[PDB]
Design a protein around this ligand. Structure first.
Ligand SMILES: [Mg+2]
Ligand SMILES: [Mg+2]
Ligand SMILES: [Mg+2]
Ligand SMILES: [Mg+2]
Ligand SMILES: [Mg+2]
Ligand SMILES: [Mg+2]
Ligand SMILES: [Mg+2]
Ligand SMILES: [Mg+2]
Ligand SMILES: [Mg+2]
Ligand SMILES: [Mg+2]
Ligand SMILES: [Mg+2]
Ligand SMILES: [Mg+2]
Ligand SMILES: [Mg+2]
Ligand SMILES: [Mg+2]
Ligand SMILES: [Mg+2]
Ligand SMILES: [Mg+2]
Ligand SMILES: [Mg+2]
Ligand SMILES: [Mg+2]
Ligand SMILES: [Mg+2]
Ligand SMILES: [Mg+2]
Ligand SMILES: [Mg+2]
Ligand SMILES: [Mg+2]
Ligand SMILES: [Mg+2]
Ligand SMILES: [Mg+2]
Ligand SMILES: [Mg+2]
Ligand SMILES: [Mg+2]
Ligand SMILES: [Mg+2]
Ligand SMILES: [Mg+2]
Ligand SMILES: [Mg+2]
Ligand SMILES: [Mg+2]
Ligand SMILES: [Mg+2]
Ligand SMILES: [Mg+2]
Ligand SMILES: [Mg+2]
Ligand SMILES: [Mg+2]
Ligand SMILES: [Mg+2]
Ligand SMILES: [Mg+2]
Ligand SMILES: [Mg+2]
Ligand SMILES: [Mg+2]
Ligand SMILES: [Mg+2]
Ligand SMILES: [Mg+2]
Ligand SMILES: [Mg+2]
Ligand SMILES: [Mg+2]
Ligand SMILES: [Mg+2]
Ligand SMILES: [Mg+2]
Ligand SMILES: [Mg+2]
Ligand SMILES: [Mg+2]
Ligand SMILES: [Mg+2]
Ligand SMILES: [Mg+2]
Ligand SMILES: [Mg+2]
Ligand SMILES: [Mg+2]
Ligand SMILES: [Mg+2]
Ligand SMILES: [Mg+2]
Ligand SMILES: [Mg+2]
Ligand SMILES: [Zn+2]
Lengths: 69, 83, 23, 181, 116
RNA sequence: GCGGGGUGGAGCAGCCUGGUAGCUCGUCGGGCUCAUAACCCGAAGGUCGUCGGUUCAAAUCCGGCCCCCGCAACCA
RNA sequence: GGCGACACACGUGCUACAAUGCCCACUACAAAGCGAUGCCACCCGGCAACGGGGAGCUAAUCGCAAAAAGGUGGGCCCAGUUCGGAUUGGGGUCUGCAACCCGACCCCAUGAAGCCGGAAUCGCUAGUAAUCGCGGAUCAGCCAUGCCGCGGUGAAUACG
RNA sequence: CGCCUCCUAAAAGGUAACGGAGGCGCCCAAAGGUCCCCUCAGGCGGGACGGAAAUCCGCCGGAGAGCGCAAGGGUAGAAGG
């Protein structure tokens, strides 16, 4: 490349929030990220994160079957 | 809304008419005056004509409209906008 | 904040009680 | 040339799996990465900001490569644009820098996307290339909140030696491109 | 965009800083500070990375936030609007839903006055 | 034939110098009054007669066509 | 079913726009009234609305009931905010045959306009204005921020 | 009323009418000399803000673009960038 106009790429370490360490190259040797591919809900199979609800409505009443018949 | 300690409210006289149609082979139009009545899992599939003070609204009942009242699906006020 | 129900003063105004003004 | 994670993965897991799934009779018929061309269509630097070197400095961190300027091919009234005005940036990443960028994009950036439900499957050239768009540059790790003055996204072009969309779809997913459908 | 997709205000007490996140009020803020054992009175500019990664992990997994919460609110209204219920009409004409008067006021649902 | 115009509802600017539609009146909302006029405080409304063209872009430059104003139409 | 509509227009009001403030905790001092399918002490389940028990009292005995502003302390640090509480999502409590139209209350989330208001315009002369809570009638419940009362703290100014 | 382009002009040149139609009375210090690179309009598809059209990617595209301004001739095997 042209000299002096380009940022220098060196061995790098991107640290994720799951503790994961990524061996790569960058303009900065150390980086801390809040997420990666190894812990992101869309990536990790299908982690339902917090909404494993199952709709829940509309038949999810059943409160109750005590009415007369 | 209605306290969970009490029961799911249908006027019974209407609830009666629903079950009889499921057995004997459904279905026909249902003239009702119970807007205060709750839609219920047995009512699903029929078409109930709900009176709004003036006419009976032909209302098809589906799965997504279970917990509501019959009156929500029969508008009470005529409005086409202003001016 | 005599209108905010999530406060001491707010439930006083309403004359009601709850988590924010218990008895 | 530097050995990098995503590059080595291409030759070790991605290369063979493709010869299986498609059955190529020659070693070059197999899909390769051609070049990744990153473009910041900007144009917010028309009259107002003659100074957009911050975005060049930003793209220089992200890709370890200084972008070139793109200028207006013709004058336009509605965009308040006269012929020859500097409205964008474009850096062409090839070889090891191409990999290094994609590797950090696939493992770090794309995840850090707000409400990322997978890359769009249908953004495929038809001729066997792919293009995707980002709305922020904070998506990349090298860019902290401190050094950013104002938000700016980009266009990413990934060119493949593949002839068809299907072959292109395979090569990228195998490399680790997450699609929604 | 630290936790959870929003970058919470530094130099402010950690309990209030969480309220600047969609899905979290003061209530869910008092909760996540015990359930993670962090001092509510300290600033976010004074949070240990340990204290950070725990508060983050908990909150993103215990509650539905930002885009998803907005998604269900939208989904909830979309259906009410589609079934043809009264709650849906009021969302389709942008009029007050909760049975207020519409002769006067109602300015927040409609928007600034259109005089005649 | 020669000169000059057509722009919110009315009457005039803006045109010559391309980008940026302005003034009085009227109109709608609100004040004052028992009420009314006046008066005060707010707001709306012109894609510029058209059709074409030049240009990055036309109320603006250019051409066609419609309409209106003024002058001319002499020796015969 | 309507009287609760809603492109709009006016009167009377409520709560605000914050640091003479807002919030949390602990701690004080009223008056007037009401109360036998009535007020409900205390006890326990729930963050709570409440729910189950249950003592007393035809009430100068028992209960509604805490007065609130105030006070001691700690937080917030001038930002559409820990100001403001509208609007909406969702989960519930209560009354009542029944809360779609169309009740109040509770809890989680949402956190709008609003930075003190154009022309104009209202009230008040002393325990008054301002500000803070409290009760009653009507009444199943309640859209009361209305009305009729009651005390707390407590001004400025009147040349003419 | 002088000058430039097309037609009238009858396949050399020239050729009139108060015949049909448009332009000029400037400009450029690079819009000039040379050397070295580069190739358009448009069409379909793909891409955050981005739109019929801003910038990017792909395929097709002999020149219909461009060449300061009228018209004609010329022209990418450049006179265009
Ligand atoms: Mg508040
Ligand atoms: Mg090879
Ligand atoms: Mg495709
Ligand atoms: Mg290809
Ligand atoms: Mg960044
Ligand atoms: Mg929040
Ligand atoms: Mg109401
Ligand atoms: Mg209403
Ligand atoms: Mg003539
Ligand atoms: Mg006129
Ligand atoms: Mg003039
Ligand atoms: Mg001018
Ligand atoms: Mg008027
Ligand atoms: Mg009279
Ligand atoms: Mg008048
Ligand atoms: Mg034109
Ligand atoms: Mg042009
Ligand atoms: Mg034009
Ligand atoms: Mg113009
Ligand atoms: Mg004309
Ligand atoms: Mg004579
Ligand atoms: Mg009624
Ligand atoms: Mg009435
Ligand atoms: Mg009121
Ligand atoms: Mg007030
Ligand atoms: Mg805000
Ligand atoms: Mg504002
Ligand atoms: Mg706030
Ligand atoms: Mg709801
Ligand atoms: Mg109701
Ligand atoms: Mg302020
Ligand atoms: Mg004030
Ligand atoms: Mg005012
Ligand atoms: Mg007096
Ligand atoms: Mg006050
Ligand atoms: Mg009261
Ligand atoms: Mg009473
Ligand atoms: Mg009552
Ligand atoms: Mg001459
Ligand atoms: Mg000739
Ligand atoms: Mg000849
Ligand atoms: Mg000839
Ligand atoms: Mg000849
Ligand atoms: Mg000769
Ligand atoms: Mg040059
Ligand atoms: Mg030249
Ligand atoms: Mg030249
Ligand atoms: Mg093209
Ligand atoms: Mg396109
Ligand atoms: Mg788009
Ligand atoms: Mg485009
Ligand atoms: Mg040409
Ligand atoms: Mg010209
Ligand atoms: Zn991770």
């Amino acid at each position: 490349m042209k000299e002096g106009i380009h940022p220098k790429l060196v061995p790098a370490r991107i640290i994720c929030g799951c503790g994961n360490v990524i061996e790569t190259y960058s303009t900065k040797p150390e980086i801390y990220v809040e997420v990666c591919s190894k812990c992101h809900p869309f990536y990790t199979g299908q982690q339902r994160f917090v909404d494993t609800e199952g709709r829940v409505e509309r038949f999810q009443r059943r409160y109750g079957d005590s009415y007369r018949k | 809304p209605r306290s969970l300690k009490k029961g799911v409210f249908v006027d019974d006289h209407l609830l009666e008419k629903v079950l009889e149609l499921n057995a004997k082979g459904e279905k026909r139009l249902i003239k009702t005056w119970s807007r205060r009545s709750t839609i219920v899992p047995e009512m699903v599939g029929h078409t109930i004509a709900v009176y709004n003070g003036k006419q009976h609204v032909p209302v098809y009942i589906t799965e997504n409209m279970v917990g509501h009242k019959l009156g929500e699906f029969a508008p009470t006020r005529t409005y086409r906008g202003h001016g | 904040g005599k209108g905010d129900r999530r406060t001491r003063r707010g439930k006083i105004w309403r004359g009601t009680y709850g988590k924010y003004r218990p008895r | 040339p530097l050995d990098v994670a995503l590059k080595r993965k291409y030759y070790e897991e991605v290369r063979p799996e493709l010869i299986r799934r498609f059955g190529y009779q020659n070693v070059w018929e197999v899909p390769r990465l051609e070049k990744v061309v990153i473009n910041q269509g900007l144009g917010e630097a028309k009259e107002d900001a003659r100074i957009l070197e911050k975005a060049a400095q930003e793209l220089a961190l992200i890709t370890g490569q200084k972008p070139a300027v793109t200028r207006a091919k013709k004058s336009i009234s509605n965009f308040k644009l006269r012929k020859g005005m500097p409205i964008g940036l474009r850096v062409t990443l090839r070889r090891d820098r191409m990999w290094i960028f994609l590797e950090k994009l696939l493992n770090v950036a794309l995840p850090r996307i707000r409400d990322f439900r997978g890359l769009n499957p249908n953004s495929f050239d038809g001729r066997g290339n792919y293009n995707l768009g980002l709305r922020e540059q904070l998506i990349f790790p090298e860019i902290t909140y401190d050094m950013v003055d104002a938000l700016r996204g980009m266009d990413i072009a990934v060119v493949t030696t593949a002839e068809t969309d299907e072959e292109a779809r395979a090569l990228l997913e195998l490399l680790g491109f997450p699609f929604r459908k | 965009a630290r936790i959870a997709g929003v970058e919470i205000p530094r130099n402010k007490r950690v309990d209030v800083a969480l309220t600047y996140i969609y899905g979290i009020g003061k209530a869910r803020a008092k909760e996540a500070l015990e359930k993670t054992g962090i001092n509510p009175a300290t600033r976010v500019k004074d949070l240990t990375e340990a204290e950070v990664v725990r508060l983050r992990e908990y909150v993103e997994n215990t509650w539905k936030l930002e885009g998803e919460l907005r998604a269900e609110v939208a989904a909830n209204i979309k259906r009410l609007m589609d079934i043809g219920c009264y709650r849906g009409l009021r969302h389709r004409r942008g009029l007050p839903v909760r049975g207020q008067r519409t002769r006067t006021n109602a300015r927040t649902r409609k928007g600034p006055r259109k005089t005649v």
